[PDB]
Amino acid sequence: GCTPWPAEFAVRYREAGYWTGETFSDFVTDRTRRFADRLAVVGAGQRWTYAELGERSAVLATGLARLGIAAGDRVVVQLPNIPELFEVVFALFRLGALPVYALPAHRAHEITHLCTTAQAKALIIPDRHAGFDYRTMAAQLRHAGTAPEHVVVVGEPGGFTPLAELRADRPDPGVFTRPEASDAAFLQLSGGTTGLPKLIPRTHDDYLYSVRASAEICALGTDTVYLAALPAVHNFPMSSPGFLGTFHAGGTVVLAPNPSPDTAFSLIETERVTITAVVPPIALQWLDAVEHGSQSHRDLSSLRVLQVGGAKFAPEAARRVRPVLGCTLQQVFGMAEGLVNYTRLDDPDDIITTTQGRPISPDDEIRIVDEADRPVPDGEVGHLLTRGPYTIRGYYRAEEHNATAFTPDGFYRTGDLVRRTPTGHLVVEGRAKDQINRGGEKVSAEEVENHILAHPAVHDAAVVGMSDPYLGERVCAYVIARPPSRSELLRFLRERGLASYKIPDRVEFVDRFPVTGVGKISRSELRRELARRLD
Ligand SMILES: Nc1ncnc2c1ncn2[C@@H]1O[C@H](COP(=O)(O)OC(=O)c2cccc(O)c2O)[C@@H](O)[C@H]1O
Protein backbone atom coordinates (compact mmCIF):
# COMPACT_ATOMS: atom_id res chain seq x y z
CA GLY A 1 0.00 0.00 0.00
CA CYS A 2 2.94 2.37 -0.57
CA THR A 3 3.37 5.03 -3.25
CA PRO A 4 6.75 4.91 -5.04
CA TRP A 5 8.84 7.72 -6.38
CA PRO A 6 8.56 7.90 -10.18
CA ALA A 7 11.41 6.11 -11.93
CA GLU A 8 12.95 9.33 -13.28
CA PHE A 9 13.16 10.84 -9.80
CA ALA A 10 14.63 7.64 -8.34
CA VAL A 11 17.29 7.58 -11.07
CA ARG A 12 18.01 11.24 -10.34
CA TYR A 13 18.42 10.67 -6.61
CA ARG A 14 20.72 7.68 -7.00
CA GLU A 15 22.86 9.43 -9.65
CA ALA A 16 23.13 12.46 -7.35
CA GLY A 17 24.47 10.26 -4.52
CA TYR A 18 21.48 10.85 -2.23
CA TRP A 19 20.20 7.27 -2.49
CA THR A 20 23.27 5.11 -1.84
CA GLY A 21 21.69 1.65 -1.61
CA GLU A 22 22.57 1.07 2.06
CA THR A 23 19.89 -0.56 4.22
CA PHE A 24 19.37 -0.31 7.96
CA SER A 25 20.56 -3.95 8.21
CA ASP A 26 23.85 -2.86 6.63
CA PHE A 27 23.79 0.21 8.90
CA VAL A 28 23.60 -1.74 12.15
CA THR A 29 26.44 -4.08 11.18
CA ASP A 30 28.71 -1.41 9.74
CA ARG A 31 28.32 1.26 12.41
CA THR A 32 28.65 -1.14 15.33
CA ARG A 33 31.83 -2.57 13.81
CA ARG A 34 33.27 0.78 12.70
CA PHE A 35 32.84 2.37 16.16
CA ALA A 36 32.89 -0.84 18.23
CA ASP A 37 35.01 0.45 21.14
CA ARG A 38 33.26 3.83 21.46
CA LEU A 39 30.41 4.65 23.84
CA ALA A 40 27.09 4.45 21.97
CA VAL A 41 24.32 4.67 24.58
CA VAL A 42 24.09 6.16 28.08
CA GLY A 43 20.85 5.76 29.99
CA ALA A 44 19.10 4.18 32.97
CA GLY A 45 22.41 3.33 34.64
CA GLN A 46 23.64 1.60 31.46
CA ARG A 47 26.67 2.50 29.34
CA TRP A 48 26.80 0.47 26.09
CA THR A 49 29.62 0.59 23.56
CA TYR A 50 28.76 0.21 19.88
CA ALA A 51 30.05 -3.35 20.16
CA GLU A 52 27.63 -4.09 23.01
CA LEU A 53 24.71 -2.55 21.13
CA GLY A 54 25.68 -4.76 18.18
CA GLU A 55 25.81 -7.95 20.27
CA ARG A 56 22.61 -7.14 22.17
CA SER A 57 20.68 -6.42 18.99
CA ALA A 58 21.93 -9.63 17.33
CA VAL A 59 20.74 -11.64 20.33
CA LEU A 60 17.36 -9.87 20.38
CA ALA A 61 16.87 -10.34 16.64
CA THR A 62 17.50 -14.07 17.10
CA GLY A 63 14.89 -14.06 19.88
CA LEU A 64 12.30 -12.20 17.77
CA ALA A 65 12.86 -14.63 14.91
CA ARG A 66 12.23 -17.48 17.34
CA LEU A 67 9.11 -15.64 18.49
CA GLY A 68 7.81 -15.63 14.91
CA ILE A 69 8.80 -12.20 13.58
CA ALA A 70 9.90 -12.49 9.94
CA ALA A 71 11.18 -10.11 7.27
CA GLY A 72 8.45 -7.67 6.29
CA ASP A 73 6.39 -8.07 9.47
CA ARG A 74 5.30 -4.86 11.20
CA VAL A 75 6.06 -4.44 14.92
CA VAL A 76 4.62 -1.53 16.91
CA VAL A 77 7.33 -0.05 19.16
CA GLN A 78 6.07 2.24 21.96
CA LEU A 79 9.00 2.63 24.37
CA PRO A 80 10.14 5.57 26.55
CA ASN A 81 13.69 7.00 26.49
CA ILE A 82 15.41 3.83 27.75
CA PRO A 83 18.41 1.98 26.21
CA GLU A 84 16.22 -1.03 25.34
CA LEU A 85 14.64 1.13 22.62
CA PHE A 86 17.85 1.10 20.60
CA GLU A 87 18.54 -2.60 21.00
CA VAL A 88 14.95 -3.32 20.00
CA VAL A 89 15.04 -1.09 16.94
CA PHE A 90 18.42 -2.36 15.73
CA ALA A 91 17.16 -5.93 16.22
CA LEU A 92 14.11 -5.29 14.05
CA PHE A 93 16.41 -3.81 11.43
CA ARG A 94 18.60 -6.92 11.50
CA LEU A 95 15.59 -9.11 10.67
CA GLY A 96 14.28 -6.89 7.89
CA ALA A 97 11.16 -6.26 10.00
CA LEU A 98 9.42 -2.86 10.04
CA PRO A 99 9.20 -0.83 13.25
CA VAL A 100 5.93 1.10 13.56
CA TYR A 101 6.75 3.97 15.90
CA ALA A 102 4.32 5.08 18.58
CA LEU A 103 5.10 7.77 21.19
CA PRO A 104 4.82 7.19 24.97
CA ALA A 105 1.88 9.64 25.20
CA HIS A 106 -0.19 7.66 22.69
CA ARG A 107 -3.06 5.65 24.13
CA ALA A 108 -5.47 2.83 23.26
CA HIS A 109 -7.07 4.80 20.41
CA GLU A 110 -3.85 5.51 18.49
CA ILE A 111 -2.27 2.15 19.32
CA THR A 112 -5.34 0.25 18.15
CA HIS A 113 -5.22 2.31 14.95
CA LEU A 114 -1.53 1.49 14.38
CA CYS A 115 -1.83 -2.22 15.14
CA THR A 116 -4.91 -2.76 12.98
CA THR A 117 -3.80 -0.57 10.05
CA ALA A 118 -0.24 -1.97 9.93
CA GLN A 119 -1.48 -5.52 10.71
CA ALA A 120 1.25 -5.66 13.34
CA LYS A 121 2.51 -9.05 14.50
CA ALA A 122 3.94 -7.73 17.78
CA LEU A 123 3.68 -4.80 20.18
CA ILE A 124 6.67 -3.81 22.34
CA ILE A 125 5.93 -1.69 25.43
CA PRO A 126 7.25 -0.91 28.91
CA ASP A 127 5.35 -2.08 31.97
CA ARG A 128 4.58 1.42 33.29
CA HIS A 129 5.81 4.89 32.38
CA ALA A 130 4.67 8.22 33.84
CA GLY A 131 1.81 6.60 35.74
CA PHE A 132 0.31 4.77 32.73
CA ASP A 133 0.13 0.96 32.65
CA TYR A 134 0.78 -0.21 29.08
CA ARG A 135 0.10 -3.82 30.08
CA THR A 136 -3.49 -2.84 30.93
CA MET A 137 -3.75 -1.09 27.55
CA ALA A 138 -2.49 -4.21 25.75
CA ALA A 139 -4.99 -6.30 27.73
CA GLN A 140 -7.73 -3.90 26.60
CA LEU A 141 -6.78 -4.47 22.95
CA ARG A 142 -6.67 -8.23 23.56
CA HIS A 143 -10.11 -8.07 25.17
CA ALA A 144 -11.41 -6.16 22.13
CA GLY A 145 -9.70 -8.48 19.63
CA THR A 146 -7.38 -5.81 18.22
CA ALA A 147 -4.04 -6.68 19.82
CA PRO A 148 -1.04 -8.18 18.04
CA GLU A 149 -0.56 -11.86 18.77
CA HIS A 150 2.80 -11.06 20.45
CA VAL A 151 3.11 -8.44 23.21
CA VAL A 152 6.62 -7.93 24.62
CA VAL A 153 7.07 -6.04 27.90
CA VAL A 154 10.18 -4.24 29.12
CA GLY A 155 10.07 -4.49 32.91
CA GLU A 156 7.54 -6.63 34.78
CA PRO A 157 5.64 -8.53 32.08
CA GLY A 158 2.35 -9.42 33.71
CA GLY A 159 1.09 -12.26 31.55
CA PHE A 160 2.80 -11.07 28.36
CA THR A 161 6.22 -11.95 26.94
CA PRO A 162 9.11 -10.52 28.99
CA LEU A 163 11.84 -8.97 26.88
CA ALA A 164 14.35 -11.25 28.64
CA GLU A 165 12.77 -14.26 26.91
CA LEU A 166 14.03 -12.85 23.60
CA ARG A 167 17.65 -12.93 24.86
CA ALA A 168 17.65 -16.68 25.66
CA ASP A 169 19.47 -17.80 22.49
CA ARG A 170 22.90 -17.02 21.10
CA PRO A 171 23.16 -14.94 17.89
CA ASP A 172 22.18 -16.71 14.66
CA PRO A 173 22.93 -14.49 11.64
CA GLY A 174 21.14 -17.14 9.57
CA VAL A 175 17.80 -15.64 10.62
CA PHE A 176 18.77 -12.11 9.57
CA THR A 177 17.54 -10.63 6.29
CA ARG A 178 18.86 -7.77 4.17
CA PRO A 179 15.92 -5.98 2.49
CA GLU A 180 16.03 -3.78 -0.60
CA ALA A 181 16.94 -0.16 0.10
CA SER A 182 13.89 1.02 -1.87
CA ASP A 183 11.56 -0.93 0.46
CA ALA A 184 9.85 0.73 3.39
CA ALA A 185 12.14 0.40 6.43
CA PHE A 186 9.55 1.50 9.01
CA LEU A 187 6.25 3.34 9.42
CA GLN A 188 5.61 6.38 11.59
CA LEU A 189 2.62 8.54 12.48
CA SER A 190 1.76 11.87 10.90
CA GLY A 191 0.78 14.79 13.08
CA GLY A 192 -2.83 14.32 12.02
CA THR A 193 -5.47 16.68 10.63
CA THR A 194 -8.68 14.66 10.08
CA GLY A 195 -10.33 11.94 12.16
CA LEU A 196 -7.28 9.65 12.37
CA PRO A 197 -3.53 9.98 11.84
CA LYS A 198 -2.09 8.56 8.64
CA LEU A 199 0.84 6.16 8.60
CA ILE A 200 3.99 7.33 6.80
CA PRO A 201 6.25 4.74 5.11
CA ARG A 202 9.91 5.76 4.94
CA THR A 203 12.45 3.83 2.85
CA HIS A 204 16.05 2.94 3.70
CA ASP A 205 17.47 5.13 0.94
CA ASP A 206 15.43 8.28 1.58
CA TYR A 207 15.55 8.19 5.40
CA LEU A 208 19.25 7.35 5.54
CA TYR A 209 19.85 10.20 3.08
CA SER A 210 18.15 12.68 5.41
CA VAL A 211 20.16 11.23 8.33
CA ARG A 212 23.56 11.47 6.62
CA ALA A 213 22.90 14.97 5.28
CA SER A 214 21.59 16.17 8.65
CA ALA A 215 24.65 14.75 10.41
CA GLU A 216 26.78 16.83 8.06
CA ILE A 217 24.67 20.01 8.47
CA CYS A 218 24.91 19.65 12.27
CA ALA A 219 28.68 18.93 12.33
CA LEU A 220 28.36 15.53 14.02
CA GLY A 221 31.35 13.28 14.66
CA THR A 222 32.72 10.76 17.11
CA ASP A 223 32.97 13.65 19.61
CA THR A 224 29.20 14.22 19.43
CA VAL A 225 27.24 13.68 22.64
CA TYR A 226 23.55 13.91 21.70
CA LEU A 227 20.99 14.37 24.49
CA ALA A 228 17.63 12.84 23.56
CA ALA A 229 15.40 15.25 25.49
CA LEU A 230 12.32 14.56 23.30
CA PRO A 231 10.69 11.12 22.82
CA ALA A 232 13.45 9.49 20.85
CA VAL A 233 11.31 7.86 18.12
CA HIS A 234 9.78 11.13 16.97
CA ASN A 235 11.14 12.21 13.58
CA PHE A 236 12.96 15.21 15.07
CA PRO A 237 15.04 13.43 17.78
CA MET A 238 15.38 10.33 15.57
CA SER A 239 16.77 11.83 12.33
CA SER A 240 17.20 15.65 12.46
CA PRO A 241 19.96 14.63 13.08
CA GLY A 242 18.76 12.73 16.15
CA PHE A 243 20.05 9.43 17.47
CA LEU A 244 20.35 7.91 13.98
CA GLY A 245 22.59 10.79 12.90
CA THR A 246 24.65 10.39 16.07
CA PHE A 247 25.06 6.63 15.48
CA HIS A 248 25.93 7.28 11.83
CA ALA A 249 28.71 9.61 12.96
CA GLY A 250 29.96 7.45 15.84
CA GLY A 251 28.95 9.70 18.74
CA THR A 252 27.25 9.04 22.06
CA VAL A 253 23.48 9.10 22.60
CA VAL A 254 22.42 10.15 26.11
CA LEU A 255 18.80 9.40 27.04
CA ALA A 256 16.96 11.92 29.18
CA PRO A 257 14.03 10.34 31.10
CA ASN A 258 12.23 13.71 31.12
CA PRO A 259 13.05 17.17 29.72
CA SER A 260 12.86 19.07 33.01
CA PRO A 261 15.65 21.64 33.49
CA ASP A 262 16.98 19.80 36.52
CA THR A 263 17.17 16.36 34.84
CA ALA A 264 18.42 17.67 31.50
CA PHE A 265 20.97 20.09 32.95
CA SER A 266 22.28 17.36 35.25
CA LEU A 267 22.86 15.10 32.23
CA ILE A 268 24.46 17.93 30.23
CA GLU A 269 26.83 18.57 33.15
CA THR A 270 27.70 14.91 33.76
CA GLU A 271 27.91 13.51 30.20
CA ARG A 272 29.20 16.74 28.58
CA VAL A 273 26.42 16.88 25.99
CA THR A 274 27.34 18.79 22.82
CA ILE A 275 23.95 19.02 21.08
CA THR A 276 20.30 18.47 21.96
CA ALA A 277 16.85 19.04 20.43
CA VAL A 278 13.80 20.52 22.18
CA VAL A 279 10.40 22.06 21.44
CA PRO A 280 9.88 25.78 22.22
CA PRO A 281 8.10 25.30 25.59
CA ILE A 282 11.04 23.24 26.86
CA ALA A 283 13.48 25.81 25.49
CA LEU A 284 11.63 28.54 27.38
CA GLN A 285 11.68 26.49 30.59
CA TRP A 286 15.45 25.99 30.29
CA LEU A 287 16.05 29.66 29.50
CA ASP A 288 13.96 30.84 32.45
CA ALA A 289 15.57 28.31 34.79
CA VAL A 290 19.06 29.62 34.01
CA GLU A 291 18.33 33.33 33.55
CA HIS A 292 16.07 33.81 36.58
CA GLY A 293 18.31 31.98 39.02
CA SER A 294 17.00 28.50 39.75
CA GLN A 295 19.69 26.74 37.66
CA SER A 296 22.24 29.54 37.18
CA HIS A 297 25.03 27.41 38.66
CA ARG A 298 24.87 24.57 36.11
CA ASP A 299 27.89 24.06 33.86
CA LEU A 300 26.44 23.95 30.34
CA SER A 301 29.74 24.85 28.65
CA SER A 302 29.96 21.60 26.67
CA LEU A 303 26.69 22.41 24.87
CA ARG A 304 27.49 23.63 21.35
CA VAL A 305 24.10 23.51 19.59
CA LEU A 306 20.57 23.79 20.96
CA GLN A 307 18.05 22.75 18.32
CA VAL A 308 14.53 24.15 18.71
CA GLY A 309 11.77 22.87 16.45
CA GLY A 310 8.34 21.29 16.11
CA ALA A 311 6.51 24.58 16.79
CA LYS A 312 7.08 28.28 16.25
CA PHE A 313 9.93 29.84 18.28
CA ALA A 314 9.61 33.61 18.66
CA PRO A 315 12.58 35.83 17.73
CA GLU A 316 12.39 37.41 21.18
CA ALA A 317 13.06 34.02 22.80
CA ALA A 318 15.48 32.92 20.08
CA ARG A 319 17.66 35.93 20.93
CA ARG A 320 18.07 34.70 24.52
CA VAL A 321 19.77 31.39 23.66
CA ARG A 322 23.37 32.47 23.16
CA PRO A 323 23.41 35.04 25.99
CA VAL A 324 21.63 32.84 28.55
CA LEU A 325 22.85 29.35 27.63
CA GLY A 326 26.09 30.19 25.81
CA CYS A 327 25.41 28.03 22.75
CA THR A 328 24.37 28.41 19.13
CA LEU A 329 20.68 28.23 18.34
CA GLN A 330 19.60 26.04 15.43
CA GLN A 331 15.99 26.27 14.31
CA VAL A 332 14.57 23.13 12.74
CA PHE A 333 11.30 23.15 10.77
CA GLY A 334 10.61 19.59 9.66
CA MET A 335 7.85 17.07 9.22
CA ALA A 336 7.42 13.31 9.48
CA GLU A 337 6.32 13.28 5.82
CA GLY A 338 9.75 14.47 4.68
CA LEU A 339 11.03 18.03 4.30
CA VAL A 340 13.41 19.24 7.03
CA ASN A 341 14.77 22.81 7.20
CA TYR A 342 17.74 23.96 9.31
CA THR A 343 19.30 27.27 10.09
CA ARG A 344 22.98 26.71 9.43
CA LEU A 345 25.48 26.77 12.24
CA ASP A 346 27.40 29.56 10.46
CA ASP A 347 24.37 31.68 9.54
CA PRO A 348 24.41 35.19 11.04
CA ASP A 349 22.44 35.61 14.25
CA ASP A 350 19.61 37.61 12.65
CA ILE A 351 18.96 34.75 10.24
CA ILE A 352 19.33 32.19 13.04
CA THR A 353 16.91 34.05 15.35
CA THR A 354 14.37 35.16 12.71
CA THR A 355 14.01 32.15 10.36
CA GLN A 356 13.19 28.44 10.54
CA GLY A 357 16.01 27.50 8.14
CA ARG A 358 16.43 26.24 4.60
CA PRO A 359 16.01 22.70 3.23
CA ILE A 360 18.46 19.81 3.54
CA SER A 361 18.71 18.98 -0.14
CA PRO A 362 19.48 20.91 -3.32
CA ASP A 363 16.68 18.75 -4.75
CA ASP A 364 14.15 19.85 -2.12
CA GLU A 365 11.62 21.60 -4.33
CA ILE A 366 9.73 24.40 -2.57
CA ARG A 367 6.55 25.93 -4.02
CA ILE A 368 4.75 28.74 -2.16
CA VAL A 369 1.32 29.16 -3.77
CA ASP A 370 -2.00 30.93 -3.22
CA GLU A 371 -5.45 29.31 -2.90
CA ALA A 372 -5.33 28.48 -6.64
CA ASP A 373 -1.85 26.90 -6.56
CA ARG A 374 -0.41 29.98 -8.23
CA PRO A 375 3.05 30.91 -6.87
CA VAL A 376 3.11 34.05 -4.75
CA PRO A 377 5.71 36.79 -5.39
CA ASP A 378 8.93 35.90 -3.62
CA GLY A 379 8.70 37.14 -0.03
CA GLU A 380 4.92 36.83 0.38
CA VAL A 381 3.17 34.28 2.58
CA GLY A 382 1.41 31.31 0.99
CA HIS A 383 0.78 27.59 1.16
CA LEU A 384 3.91 25.44 1.29
CA LEU A 385 4.14 22.56 -1.18
CA THR A 386 7.26 20.46 -1.36
CA ARG A 387 8.69 17.53 -3.29
CA GLY A 388 12.05 15.85 -2.86
CA PRO A 389 14.34 12.87 -2.29
CA TYR A 390 13.10 12.15 1.25
CA THR A 391 9.51 13.45 1.01
CA ILE A 392 6.87 10.75 0.56
CA ARG A 393 4.56 10.53 -2.45
CA GLY A 394 1.65 9.07 -0.47
CA TYR A 395 0.46 7.85 2.89
CA TYR A 396 0.21 4.16 3.70
CA ARG A 397 -3.10 2.62 2.58
CA ALA A 398 -4.77 6.04 2.34
CA GLU A 399 -5.78 6.46 -1.29
CA GLU A 400 -8.77 8.73 -0.67
CA HIS A 401 -6.70 11.02 1.56
CA ASN A 402 -3.74 10.78 -0.83
CA ALA A 403 -5.94 12.24 -3.57
CA THR A 404 -6.16 15.43 -1.49
CA ALA A 405 -2.78 15.58 0.27
CA PHE A 406 -0.67 15.41 -2.91
CA THR A 407 -0.94 17.25 -6.20
CA PRO A 408 -1.11 15.21 -9.42
CA ASP A 409 2.59 15.86 -10.11
CA GLY A 410 3.59 14.67 -6.64
CA PHE A 411 3.95 17.78 -4.47
CA TYR A 412 3.05 17.19 -0.83
CA ARG A 413 0.65 19.75 0.69
CA THR A 414 2.28 20.53 4.04
CA GLY A 415 -0.61 22.65 5.32
CA ASP A 416 1.84 25.31 6.48
CA LEU A 417 1.79 29.00 5.67
CA VAL A 418 5.34 30.25 5.04
CA ARG A 419 7.33 32.94 3.25
CA ARG A 420 10.77 32.65 1.68
CA THR A 421 13.73 34.96 2.24
CA PRO A 422 16.30 35.90 -0.43
CA THR A 423 18.73 33.31 1.02
CA GLY A 424 16.21 30.47 0.70
CA HIS A 425 15.32 30.37 4.39
CA LEU A 426 11.66 29.92 5.29
CA VAL A 427 9.66 31.74 7.95
CA VAL A 428 6.67 29.85 9.35
CA GLU A 429 3.82 32.35 9.62
CA GLY A 430 0.70 30.24 10.00
CA ARG A 431 -1.10 27.05 9.15
CA ALA A 432 -3.93 26.06 6.83
CA LYS A 433 -4.61 22.52 8.08
CA ASP A 434 -7.00 21.66 10.90
CA GLN A 435 -4.33 21.02 13.51
CA ILE A 436 -3.71 22.62 16.90
CA ASN A 437 0.02 22.73 17.63
CA ARG A 438 0.31 22.44 21.41
CA GLY A 439 3.99 23.15 21.98
CA GLY A 440 5.03 20.68 19.28
CA GLU A 441 2.40 18.00 19.90
CA LYS A 442 -0.24 17.98 17.17
CA VAL A 443 -3.97 17.68 17.94
CA SER A 444 -6.69 17.25 15.33
CA ALA A 445 -9.76 19.25 16.35
CA GLU A 446 -12.03 16.91 14.39
CA GLU A 447 -10.70 13.86 16.27
CA VAL A 448 -11.17 15.32 19.77
CA GLU A 449 -14.62 16.57 18.72
CA ASN A 450 -15.59 13.12 17.48
CA HIS A 451 -14.68 11.63 20.85
CA ILE A 452 -16.50 14.39 22.78
CA LEU A 453 -19.62 13.85 20.63
CA ALA A 454 -19.55 10.19 21.70
CA HIS A 455 -20.50 11.27 25.23
CA PRO A 456 -24.21 10.70 25.97
CA ALA A 457 -24.76 14.12 27.57
CA VAL A 458 -23.29 16.08 24.63
CA HIS A 459 -25.26 17.55 21.74
CA ASP A 460 -22.52 19.47 19.88
CA ALA A 461 -18.87 20.46 20.30
CA ALA A 462 -16.16 22.57 18.66
CA VAL A 463 -12.45 22.16 19.47
CA VAL A 464 -10.18 25.15 18.87
CA GLY A 465 -6.73 26.37 19.85
CA MET A 466 -6.32 29.22 22.32
CA SER A 467 -3.20 31.36 22.04
CA ASP A 468 -0.61 30.59 24.71
CA PRO A 469 2.78 32.29 25.23
CA TYR A 470 4.61 29.04 26.05
CA LEU A 471 2.78 26.39 23.98
CA GLY A 472 1.56 28.56 21.12
CA GLU A 473 -1.86 26.97 21.57
CA ARG A 474 -3.75 25.16 24.28
CA VAL A 475 -6.76 23.00 23.44
CA CYS A 476 -10.16 24.54 24.24
CA ALA A 477 -13.44 22.67 23.77
CA TYR A 478 -16.80 24.41 23.47
CA VAL A 479 -19.50 21.88 24.40
CA ILE A 480 -23.28 22.17 23.96
CA ALA A 481 -24.88 19.60 26.26
CA ARG A 482 -28.56 18.57 25.94
CA PRO A 483 -24.26 19.23 30.99
CA PRO A 484 -21.68 16.76 32.46
CA SER A 485 -18.93 17.68 34.88
CA ARG A 486 -15.74 19.03 33.31
CA SER A 487 -13.78 16.40 35.24
CA GLU A 488 -16.29 13.78 34.10
CA LEU A 489 -15.96 14.76 30.44
CA LEU A 490 -12.15 14.62 30.56
CA ARG A 491 -12.42 11.26 32.33
CA PHE A 492 -14.65 9.91 29.55
CA LEU A 493 -12.09 11.14 27.02
CA ARG A 494 -9.32 9.25 28.85
CA GLU A 495 -11.49 6.13 28.87
CA ARG A 496 -11.90 6.63 25.10
CA GLY A 497 -8.14 6.14 24.71
CA LEU A 498 -7.21 9.61 23.44
CA ALA A 499 -3.52 10.50 23.56
CA SER A 500 -2.61 12.38 26.73
CA TYR A 501 -1.87 15.67 24.92
CA LYS A 502 -5.19 15.63 23.00
CA ILE A 503 -7.27 16.00 26.19
CA PRO A 504 -8.54 19.62 26.22
CA ASP A 505 -6.81 22.12 28.47
CA ARG A 506 -10.06 24.07 28.79
CA VAL A 507 -13.73 23.06 28.60
CA GLU A 508 -16.48 25.72 28.26
CA PHE A 509 -20.10 24.51 28.31
CA VAL A 510 -22.37 26.85 26.34
CA ASP A 511 -26.01 26.93 25.27
CA ARG A 512 -24.78 27.94 21.80
CA PHE A 513 -21.49 28.64 20.09
CA PRO A 514 -20.67 32.35 20.74
CA VAL A 515 -20.38 33.20 17.03
CA THR A 516 -22.75 34.82 14.54
CA GLY A 517 -24.37 32.64 11.88
CA VAL A 518 -23.63 29.19 13.31
CA GLY A 519 -26.06 27.44 10.98
CA LYS A 520 -24.64 29.35 8.00
CA ILE A 521 -20.88 28.61 8.23
CA SER A 522 -18.85 25.44 7.89
CA ARG A 523 -17.30 23.63 10.86
CA SER A 524 -13.85 24.88 9.83
CA GLU A 525 -15.17 28.45 9.68
CA LEU A 526 -16.78 27.91 13.08
CA ARG A 527 -13.47 26.81 14.61
CA ARG A 528 -11.68 29.78 13.06
CA GLU A 529 -14.20 32.24 14.52
CA LEU A 530 -14.20 30.62 17.97
CA ALA A 531 -10.39 30.62 18.00
CA ARG A 532 -10.39 34.30 16.97
CA ARG A 533 -12.48 34.96 20.09
CA LEU A 534 -9.69 33.39 22.17
CA ASP A 535 -6.87 35.55 20.81
N1 LIG B 1 10.29 25.15 13.50
C2 LIG B 1 8.96 25.07 13.32
N3 LIG B 1 8.18 26.17 13.35
C4 LIG B 1 6.85 26.11 13.18
N5 LIG B 1 6.20 24.96 12.95
C6 LIG B 1 6.86 23.78 12.89
C7 LIG B 1 8.32 23.76 13.08
N8 LIG B 1 8.71 22.48 12.97
C9 LIG B 1 7.59 21.73 12.74
N10 LIG B 1 6.50 22.52 12.69
C11 LIG B 1 5.11 22.08 12.48
O12 LIG B 1 5.03 20.69 12.70
C13 LIG B 1 4.57 20.03 11.48
C14 LIG B 1 5.17 18.65 11.38
O15 LIG B 1 5.01 17.94 12.60
P16 LIG B 1 5.83 16.60 12.89
O17 LIG B 1 5.23 15.62 11.90
O18 LIG B 1 5.56 16.30 14.35
O19 LIG B 1 7.44 16.88 12.79
C20 LIG B 1 8.25 17.93 13.43
O21 LIG B 1 7.78 18.73 14.22
C22 LIG B 1 9.72 18.04 13.13
C23 LIG B 1 10.47 19.16 13.49
C24 LIG B 1 11.83 19.25 13.19
C25 LIG B 1 12.51 18.23 12.52
C26 LIG B 1 11.84 17.08 12.11
O27 LIG B 1 12.51 16.09 11.46
C28 LIG B 1 10.39 16.94 12.40
O29 LIG B 1 9.69 15.84 12.03
C30 LIG B 1 4.95 21.03 10.40
O31 LIG B 1 4.29 20.81 9.16
C32 LIG B 1 4.61 22.35 11.07
O33 LIG B 1 3.20 22.53 11.16
- Residue 220: CB atoms within 10 A of its CB come to 24
For residue 336, the CA-to-ligand 1 centroid distance in Å is 8
Is 531 annotated to bind ligand?
Answer: no
- Could you tell me which residues come within 8 angstroms of residue 381 by beta carbon, excluding any fewer than 6 positions away? 368, 417, 418, 419, 429, 430
Contact 396, 198 (CB under 8 A): yes
- Could you tell me which residues come within 8 angstroms of residue 267 by beta carbon, excluding any fewer than 6 positions away? 227, 254, 256, 273
Which one of 333, 337, 364 would you pick to mutate in the ligand 1 pocket, going by the greatest count of ligand atoms within 8 A of its CB? 333
Q: Which stretches of 454-500 are DSSP H helices?
A: 486-495
Contact 385, 415 (CB under 8 A): no
- Could you tell me which residues come within 8 angstroms of residue 37 by beta carbon, excluding any fewer than 6 positions away? 49, 50, 51
For residue 528, the CA-to-ligand 1 centroid distance in Å is 21
Atom 33 in ligand 1: residue holding the nearest Cα: 416
Atom 12 in ligand 1: residue holding the nearest Cα: 310
> CA-CA distance, 334 to 348, in Å (whole number)?
21
Q: Beta strand pairing status for 150-154 and 199-203? A: unpaired
Closest CA to 60 of 87, 24, 21, 35: 87
Is 416 annotated to bind ligand?
Answer: yes
Name the experimental technique: X-ray
* Three-class SS state of 86: helix
> CA-CA distance, 317 to 84, in Å (whole number)?
35
What is the CB-side half-sphere exposure of residue 366 using CA atoms within 13 A? 24
Backbone φ/ψ region at 285: left (φ over 0), alpha (ψ -120 to 50), beta = alpha
Q: State the greatest distance between any 2 C-alpha atoms of the chain, in Å, as a whole number.
A: 69
Contact 256, 81 (CB under 8 A): yes
Phi–psi pair at 486, nearest 5 degrees: -60, -50
> CA-CA distance, 138 to 155, in Å (whole number)?
14
> CA-CA distance, 370 to 427, in Å (whole number)?
16
Domains of the chain: 1-433 (3.40.50.12780), 434-535 (3.30.300.30)
DSSP summary character for residue 374: P
Atom 29 in ligand 1: residue holding the nearest Cα: 335
Is 332 annotated to bind ligand?
Answer: yes
Q: How far is CA 446 from its chain centroid?
A: 20
What is the CB-side half-sphere exposure of residue 42 using CA atoms within 13 A? 20
- Residue 119: CB atoms within 10 A of its CB come to 11
For residue 439, the CA-to-ligand 1 centroid distance in Å is 11
Contact 12, 363 (CB under 8 A): yes
Is 198 annotated to bind ligand?
Answer: no
> CA-CA distance, 262 to 247, in Å (whole number)?
26
Is 310 annotated to bind ligand?
Answer: yes
Is 442 annotated to bind ligand?
Answer: yes
Q: CA angle, corner 295, sides to 293 and 301, nearest 5? A: 120
Which one of 101, 335, 416 would you pick to mutate in the ligand 1 pocket, going by the greatest count of ligand atoms within 8 A of its CB? 335
For residue 515, the CA-to-ligand 1 centroid distance in Å is 31
Phi–psi pair at 31, nearest 5 degrees: -70, -40
Residue ranges lining ligand 1, Cβ < 6 Å: 191, 235-236, 239-240, 309-312, 331-336, 340, 356, 414, 416, 428, 431, 437, 442
The secondary structure of 423-457, three-state, reads CCCEEEEEECCCCEEECCEEECHHHHHHHHHCCCC
> CA-CA distance, 387 to 333, in Å (whole number)?
15
